[PDB]
Design a protein around this ligand. Structure first.
Ligand SMILES: *[C@@H]1O[C@H](CO)[C@@H](O[C@@H]2O[C@H](CO)[C@@H](O[C@@H]3O[C@H](CO)[C@@H](O)[C@H](O)[C@@H]3O)[C@H](O)[C@H]2NC(C)=O)[C@H](O)[C@H]1NC(C)=O
Ligand SMILES: *[C@@H]1O[C@H](CO)[C@@H](O[C@@H]2O[C@H](CO)[C@@H](O)[C@H](O)[C@H]2NC(C)=O)[C@H](O)[C@H]1NC(C)=O
Ligand SMILES: *[C@@H]1O[C@H](CO)[C@@H](O[C@@H]2O[C@H](CO)[C@@H](O)[C@H](O)[C@H]2NC(C)=O)[C@H](O)[C@H]1NC(C)=O
Ligand SMILES: *[C@@H]1O[C@H](CO)[C@@H](O[C@@H]2O[C@H](CO)[C@@H](O)[C@H](O)[C@H]2NC(C)=O)[C@H](O)[C@H]1NC(C)=O
Lengths: 324, 170, 324, 165, 169, 324
């Protein structure tokens, strides 16, 4: 007659590590490290993400003729760029404070695109065409930005221009414009008449002066002239005033902005499908409730903490010693 | 291990006992079988579920966290930003992998202790009435029926009831 | 005849948490998380903080009329702004590198406000009155910054001025000035004559020229014009030369600075009081030797490490079991 | 308990004993009472004091730490700054809470260890002269007086002097 | 000692035993001397060697890391840089210094447990055949020549055989 | 007949710390904190560091007359400034984005210095000598930078110049130049003979027209004028065009950059030696396998993690109690 004391064992092959020993076979264990992803780019809160395709933020907002697909966009869960996203600035130049703008657009959920300075009625004393360029061509025909207007002297005469907009919208308004810089002094006059022209833009908090910085430059995309692009957030009930005696790439469309939280810009080639998720990465979505993942650092939504680990297995049971 | 029980003086585990982590195996006139000790197991399960939950609960989930762009004149900042992202990554990888190691160590010792203490509850119950064979086994001096076996697994073992063991003791 | 080995127990109710078990009543323990605060803003090492009140750094340094309470200031343990610190720049404009100026001030324990370019002696050939504006009025009376002098033409004649200050104060001197940008060529003429004026500021390390940006802007506080504010830290021995043909809002008073660690700027609505503390937060002071606190991340002096926890009770005794 | 003593084979604590953590409670012919063990209690006090002090030493006081202002064109730097302050806050909150959870577990077991060790220091002195009941009690054989009781708590029991069994 | 052995019921160590962390001493009719337990000693070295290495793995080397310069209008960013460097440094010194304290604690007890388990290994072999003096010494009842001593430290001590043991009077 | 179970002991006096006890003597231990160094600056992978000595990055790249030794440098394992690195910009003025430039050089492992615009072949219509100043005097005479060419007027004549460079190096080329701002209109004519000159620089990504700001500043190194320094990274195949009617400090020597990694700049007064290391600090080299070091936070190569600790001794053996 005998009674023995002992412990569980089974057909488990799961191993764990300790400070004293590595690869200890245990009876039970949890895996704290999520390493499996959807491979897709999914909706968020029901709303699908804005795909920029072969366009980047610069091209989408300015209205690069290759980004006409995006003229319908209004609301999104987050912004997706790809490896082919290079269509943006088609007329050579600097997009000032571009990175900042991208950051601002990350905390935006939707917007209203509206015609701020209608092309047909806004510029009587100035030429509303001519403002197209091969650099920004579409369908083989020279074109230009859909949301900006390249004004030129109407019959060898460029009257000092002054235009204003009042923000009656109940939101911030993204206003974009540009400043042209001819290659030589000859080109300067051909376009704007006026040799010492200027562009002054002023609102309640914004005030800045723009002088045509003329210099000899290599041709980029056919153009030896450069064009710097600008923007600003016009606050509700505020006025913005554009004054120009030349070189002004006037606004034509603008954006009333809806601020959301939890969103941003990622670079990804993972396909976009019709599925919903709570966590999205550049590689794909994550349907997991574990604390860690080693898939990708970039995250949007409620996701597990990213980490470099190959394996994070926590023992729950004890040493497995089935010896039968 | 740290308490000498598991992989120690109790050489191996019983694949035969499927109702718990620790338990007993009795050889009786009525027969054999394995029986899991409810108390010690359910308690150990309580503690282990609590370790896991307390570890998961600390590592707070990651919300929206994308990447910022920098222009060709913002090298320094871009580098600061990288030194940060990489810094926090270095640390959280460390804090995770390191936490798991030590807790695994502690958990295996936890089980070791639990078995140990279970062996000694029984040992101090029997006293003279049984002899320690060695492999966590007690050979009885007084013949224990199933009803008696249970009292041993119950903590309600009546020792004075058996001076019969004293006879067989010699 | 018996002897028993046992352990201590008592009527303690303190609970601590462990990895295996939650809420374990113990015989003794220590709380490491300081959670009680003073609710008042107090002195540090016998020195009181500088209450800005209705003003901000800008108003204080520039000399906004509504900040005359602050003209007496000289030394302080730390600087406090409130929910209602809106009185700063009263004539619309950009404070250039304003943030950097705040950051500089965080490490200043005292200064000596002095008259760098005395009003009634430094400008023989320019008008030193009539330099007021409704924009900066106190009690319905056109006034101006107490530390800047708005020079204008002396009877249709604004001659080129050249004024140099040699910093011999043995310490960093904070010099402030502005550059006025009238809304029209008319206003430009009335104030300075000289439609093509310039401001040239130069020291050993600082070199910059300013030309007026003349354009019509939305009216801020009844002004279409704008006034940019600048600053530099003249070093001991270094000279600063001001050169203008107009548009110069000259420096009247400057500040010789005294550097001192352990100081800073915080935003608190708590009431100042006559008390001495070694640790101060926006919510109040802290008299504690504990290692942690969850009162506020912002800290001045020798304080406990801020942490997000609500409970940090560390067991010292054993499990408490009286069993009645 | 990791050591099976506290809340283990010694089922409860004594509100009666108040001059230490670990100790005894004897019977006698000369009455009953409680006694603290200076040896094992002082040893525990020193240790736990050192643990607390050590934990606090590794937490260096937070000196002057104020936030920074940014203009509306420095959102990237502002978020960076925020990401740094939050990153550090997360880590220090984690460390603090985590260290306390762990040293609390080790602390309770530290006491459980001292009790067992004490119960065994005694049991290894007495041996035959008494038998183990339970509840950490010993039933003497040779009738032990207050002076003999002391020699036990004293660690000087002199086993060779009993056979009155 | 958490496990009561080292600096506990075995008061001191043996400068005599020079070929292992744990072992025996035996006093015979043939003579005496020390002998280390290869089994227990080697398992400990395997454990410790693994602990140190594990500590070292987790601490990835520091690659090239230098400082940046800033101009007098970039104090905010300079201070951020400084807050970042000091921040990460504060944490790593913590982790390092800490990990060492908590492992020295585990290590010293680890040895305690190992001695305890070695003593209790012997005790369970001997049983009636010897009595526990103290100081971790067993007094054989049956006369234990070298081959018998070696069997005790071999894990093969006979029993029953030396059930002449009822010199237990 | 007896047998005893016991543990090892020895003459070791090594101590360690534990959470419960301080200064515990043990039988065996390992130190994890490296505290020993070379006191020397060593080569990494057989490649020596670059000693700037009395010069700094500016002096080196500009070719300050005091840095002639450095003209020969082509490759290095890391760059070294000292406490005496004062020779940089010897003619007063701002080095634009200098810090960024420094940051750039920290990812450069080598370059090829070349004559982008040869002195005695590039400027037939301008004066290639007489481009010196006492501000940059070297061993007696008024000298100048070795990498830049101060172009002056040629017999009262200074015709608009136009020089372009096409990057035919297959890697980024570092171009440096300067824009001179004389103190008076007199000097402007004495040098450039041409009272209203300009400098224009253009490439695929760079576009600026610099107009001279003639003003009298406090004399630094005897010069009331100022010289501004500019740099750009010309991409492969890109063109950079220079046009100036005066005031141009022309590029003479440029640098085709070879990018690497794990390089950088350090400040040290330690002597360079013919020795080889895998880890380097400003104090000296480190030959260690330990995971930690308390020598210096600045590190080049593969080093132990820096740490404030004074002692990090890890116990391996047991508690030592010889009690013999
Ligand atoms: C543990 O230790 C014991 C004692 O050393 C070992 O047993 C002994 O092993 C020796 C060496 O083989 C044996 O000696 C040989 O004896 C045989 C007897 O027929 C004979 O061929 C020669 O005399 C030869 O030298 C010896 O019999 C044996 N002693 C006993 C008491 O068994 C044992 O091997 C060790 N066990 C382990 C698992 O290491
Ligand atoms: C949109 O992007 C595409 C792809 O980058 C541009 O296509 C390039 O155009 C240049 C100049 O005409 C050609 O020399 C290249 O061969 C094209 N590259 C590729 C990969 O096709 C296109 O010019 C852009 N269009 C606009 C309007 O921005
Ligand atoms: C000082 O600050 C106060 C409060 O911000 C200013 O008063 C405001 O002025 C604006 C613009 O005229 C009005 O629209 C608000 O209604 C006023 N608010 C309050 C509470 O009075 C005041 O104008 C400032 N004065 C100066 C000189 O800066
Ligand atoms: C190289 O650096 C040295 C050290 O700074 C310069 O010499 C100093 O020049 C200043 C101004 O002329 C004097 O006030 C110091 O007393 C000088 N110090 C020494 C040790 O001579 C030197 O002029 C620099 N040379 C160049 C070409 O820049």
């Amino acid at each position: 007659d005998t009674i023995c004391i002992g412990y569980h064992a089974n057909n488990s092959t799961d191993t764990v590590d300790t400070v004293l020993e590595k690869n200890v076979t245990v009876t039970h264990s949890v895996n704290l490290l999520e390493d499996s992803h959807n491979g897709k780019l999914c909706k968020l809160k029901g709303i699908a993400p804005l795909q920029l395709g072969k366009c980047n933020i610069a091209g989408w907002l300015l209205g690069n003729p290759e980004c006409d697909l995006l003229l319908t966009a209004s609301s999104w869960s987050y912004i997706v760029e790809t490896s082919n996203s290079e269509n943006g600035t088609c007329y050579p130049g600097d997009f000032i404070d571009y990175e900042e703008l991208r950051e601002q657009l990350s905390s935006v959920s939707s917007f209203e695109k509206f015609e701020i300075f209608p092309k047909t009625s806004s510029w009587p004393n100035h030429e509303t065409t001519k403002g197209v360029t091969a650099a920004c061509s579409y369908a083989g025909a020279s074109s230009f930005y859909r949301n900006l207007l390249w004004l030129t002297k109407k019959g060898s005469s460029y009257p000092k221009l002054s235009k204003s907009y009042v923000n009656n919208k109940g939101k911030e308004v993204l206003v974009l414009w540009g400043v042209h810089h001819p290659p030589t002094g000859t080109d300067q006059q051909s376009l704007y008449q006026n040799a010492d022209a200027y562009v002054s833009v002023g609102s309640s908090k914004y005030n800045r002066r723009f002088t045509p910085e003329i210099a000899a430059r290599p041709k980029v995309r056919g153009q030896a002239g450069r064009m710097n692009y600008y923007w600003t957030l016009l606050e509700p009930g505020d006025t913005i005033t554009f004054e120009a005696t030349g070189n002004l790439i006037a606004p034509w469309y603008a954006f009333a902005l809806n601020r959301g939280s939890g969103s941003g810009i990622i670079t990804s080639d993972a396909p976009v499908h019709d599925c919903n998720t709570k966590c999205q990465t550049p590689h794909g979505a994550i349907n997991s409730s574990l604390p860690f993942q080693n898939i990708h650092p970039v995250t949007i939504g409620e996701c597990p903490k990213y980490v470099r680990s190959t394996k994070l297995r926590m023992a729950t049971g004890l040493r497995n010693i089935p010896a039968r | 291990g740290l308490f000498g029980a598991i992989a120690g003086f109790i050489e191996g585990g019983w694949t035969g006992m499927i109702d718990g982590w620790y338990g007993y195996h009795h050889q009786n006139e009525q027969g054999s079988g394995y029986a899991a000790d409810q108390k010690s197991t359910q308690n150990a399960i309580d503690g282990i579920t609590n370790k896991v939950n307390s570890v998961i609960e600390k590592m707070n989930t990651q919300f929206t966290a994308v990447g910022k762009e920098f222009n060709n004149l913002e090298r320094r900042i871009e580098n600061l930003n990288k030194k940060v992202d990489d810094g926090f990554l270095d640390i959280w990888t460390y804090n995770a992998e390191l936490l798991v190691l030590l807790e695994n160590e502690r958990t295996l010792d936890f089980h070791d202790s639990n078995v140990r203490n279970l062996y000694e509850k029984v040992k101090s119950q029997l006293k003279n009435n049984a002899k320690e064979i060695g492999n966590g086994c007690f050979e009885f001096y007084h013949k224990c029926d199933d009803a008696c076996m249970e009292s041993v697994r119950n903590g309600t073992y009546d020792y004075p009831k058996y001076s019969e063991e004293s006879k067989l003791n010699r």
